Scaffold this active site. Structure first.
Site, PDB file in Angstrom:
ATOM      1  N   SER A 275       0.858  -1.177   0.000  1.00  0.00           N
ATOM      2  CA  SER A 275       0.000   0.000   0.000  1.00  0.00           C
ATOM      3  C   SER A 275       0.900   1.236   0.000  1.00  0.00           C
ATOM      4  CB  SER A 275      -0.863   0.000   1.278  1.00  0.00           C
ATOM      5  OG  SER A 275      -1.508   1.253   1.458  1.00  0.00           O
TER       6      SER A 275
ATOM      7  N   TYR B 292      -2.622  -1.401  10.320  1.00  0.00           N
ATOM      8  CA  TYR B 292      -2.397  -1.451   8.876  1.00  0.00           C
ATOM      9  C   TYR B 292      -1.046  -0.849   8.454  1.00  0.00           C
ATOM     10  CZ  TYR B 292      -3.332  -1.674   3.923  1.00  0.00           C
ATOM     11  OH  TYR B 292      -3.283  -1.990   2.581  1.00  0.00           O
TER      12      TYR B 292
END
Lengths: 262, 262, 262, 262
Positions: free
Chosen positions: D146, D159
């Site tokens: 990401s 995350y």
């Protein structure tokens, strides 16, 4: 061929007659693009490169120019538009380097490397972006960097600075012009099998020393860099901008740390 | 008296008459060091700063010089060696910038910022390290960089490029001269309350917008940066070399992602 | 007495009985702080460290706890608040590692290193920040990382992953809690003269090979790291948040590129 | 089709039934590869994805498995070899996320995200690398990261940590296994038009807020990520290893700095 969206695109390449530049010229030719080959002073190689592009499937011209000279850079982009009708991809690939202890490096020598490696790329990027903006073309800039935008380089402080500069230049232009569909990216080659390195790489011990810096264990072939260039220029990389894509066989991953050392 | 090891060290500071350079001049004065204040333009500012340094507990001279002129940088280090006996800390702090859309930036304007921001620091660093090598001194170089060696900066491609270059220059010299015990680091300030910004920060809507990009919520005080400089020059930072130390209230952590937006 | 603002601050340090944790415990003792020493295993080491801290000018307690157990981390911060009145500096320093080819690393061994190195620091950081928010304290978190949040580490993929994770954890929390004046930073040590390495460094061929990867040419002394911790906890670093500060003798600058090889 | 070297390659994709995973399944199908679709609990989508791959030109199977369970990951790679004869490309794409103030985030919730996003990728990478090494295959691992391996993420500390971890995991495995011709790379997607985001992106104001974080001014289409995956898996990326290739429309370039702010 591979990238059909590249058919008939106008691609300008500085230092495009030898080494990485030539391999990119030929690969874009394989994609049936129209290639504009810049060169400093070696007409015959430029002519040879021109013929390779045509023999691979592309159209091609050659244009003499020193990237430290603003008019030559301006002239190059204008010649590309005159001849081929437009400009789609700008590749700033010119580069020079020499080893000097940093406390001994002269100002003239620092400047030569900065002017050529960083300022030349700024001038090329500028002239291309100007054209894209003026004509609403969603164009593409590829700036030729090095593992040395990340890996420091004793004896080559001018080179390292030039590419560290190139990184923030590229990222900045990518941010600035992203809303105009214009993409700007670096390629970061490791040790590559080019003309400048032919002397070193003939010597078995220097070849092994260099290969010991490469986790994949081999010196890159210019075509492997050209493959990255085609990808970046193509609409396959449509959402990819402001990045540096290292093609270095793992060299930025710290080769001295192989086998769990330190 | 914080860093007792700094007392009577010779600290050269380019652009030391105003802003961060002045704040650093004063701080090394508080540590009872011998500060050489370089300035280009306004003798009355340099004289006014020379004074704060003497009041704070230190010694000071002022030297006129343009950092884009090799003779001036060479002269400055030689003046420091004449006047105080030696050199210990070299701080390259001079910087200029101006907003221009990148596709409209002139070569001369690009060159002025590169010459000043990067090349000046190269010449500074070279001349100091040259002196350190020849005289077996475990000296120190602090290069004044910016959040913009990491944060791209549209309208300021010249500035961003110069600091990306400064990062790799610093890292190269740190690596090249580490075996000699000579340390080289960058400081990366964010938005600081200095002369250059006085315009921007007067406009209350502008001050607020700048403030909305600082996670810590305030514009940095110049002494918060000088505290980082004092640390890095000191023997407290003896194992610290080749780094960029950001003093930015969190600005490099991506302002737009505060509270989670994304 | 260096950082006068540290006197009587409450500093918790996981793994504070040996190595870098011990060096930091002592240093905050020299600054006349109130040090809470967490330890897992060897009470006699923790007691011996509690002593150095008291001799150095500070106050100290010792608390047994396993950082992989939530109740233990919660207990530790609550014990610090009971015993000394509040919390000011939270230092998550506990770490384990072992060499395994990556394709042969077991899930349990992966989990043990992640649980200890990253999750322990998450729980540490959470419980401290929780206390800072609820009680309006502009507190401080120092997460102990490694050159290996940047340097990849074959045979140690678990360790490298845990520190890459620690980097983004630290950066996120710094950004998330910056508007509250709570600062969060990492320290990144290179090869340090600590218990874990005592084996390796006894073997003179091993000590030399490790030394050949440090540009500065020596294995780091644990007090060189505690000097960075003292700085970061202090109000000298008031504008410094979200950073990793490497104390590595140049190790992140790529050992294999010393003298120019490449 | 585009990448002929991909014809008949065995490609395993975790979470391959929806979103980015599905788009990669289909794109590899377009390359006439043999695709193994993992899924957690939605058989019908998996079945639908299976049919799309076949309808595009590929062979395909589906396999149920929870990536937090070691036997399911082991089973997945074994099922791929049984069914199709070999394994060429391993794509670790599973991911979960939820917003929580970081000082309020529970240990169970932290663990769920770490176990799924980081540990799952380790398990998959391990099982693939094991197979390549045992059989002298020059295989390929793609780990789905990401923009948040670089961009910090308040409310999503689990995350962000998971992907920061993934970065050093990937880089480490790339260095470790580069001498075996095994390449390991991350893809870093920005904001993408997937199932998880359908709710948010229907709302005109939330869609605009997200688009304001994207310099290119649009939410990425999953096919644009799949294009990066095909490139990375192909022998066109032969010299590219240990990198993260961001496909984010410029999001890592600091969107708050558009138009020269700060």
């Amino acid at each position: 061929h591979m990238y059909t969206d590249l058919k008939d695109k106008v691609v300008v390449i500085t230092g495009g007659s030898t080494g990485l530049g030539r391999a990119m010229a030929v690969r874009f030719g394989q994609e049936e693009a129209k290639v504009v080959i810049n060169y400093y002073n070696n007409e015959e190689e430029a002519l040879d490169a021109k013929k390779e592009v045509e023999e691979a499937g592309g159209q091609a011209i050659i244009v003499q120019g020193d990237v430290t000279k603003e008019e030559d850079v301006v002239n190059l982009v204008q010649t590309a538009i005159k001849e081929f009708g437009t400009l789609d991809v700008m590749i700033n690939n010119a580069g020079v380097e020499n080893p000097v202890p940093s406390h001994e490096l002269s100002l003239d020598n620092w400047n030569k490397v900065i002017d050529t490696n960083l300022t030349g790329a700024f001038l090329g990027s500028r002239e291309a972006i100007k054209y894209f903006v003026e004509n609403d073309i969603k164009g593409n800039v590829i700036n030729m960097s090095s593992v040395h935008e990340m890996i420091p380089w004793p004896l080559f402080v001018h080179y390292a600075a030039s590419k560290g500069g190139m990184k923030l230049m590229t990222e900045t232009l990518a941010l600035e012009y992203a809303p105009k569909g214009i993409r700007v990216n670096n390629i970061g080659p490791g040790a590559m099998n080019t003309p400048i390195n032919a002397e070193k790489f003939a010597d078995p011990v220097q070849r092994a020393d260099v290969e010991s810096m490469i986790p994949m264990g081999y010196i890159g072939k210019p075509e492997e860099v050209a493959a990255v260039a085609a990808f970046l220029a193509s609409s396959q990389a449509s959402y990819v901008t402001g990045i540096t894509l290292f093609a270095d066989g793992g060299m930025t991953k710290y080769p001295s740390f192989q086998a769990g050392r330190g």
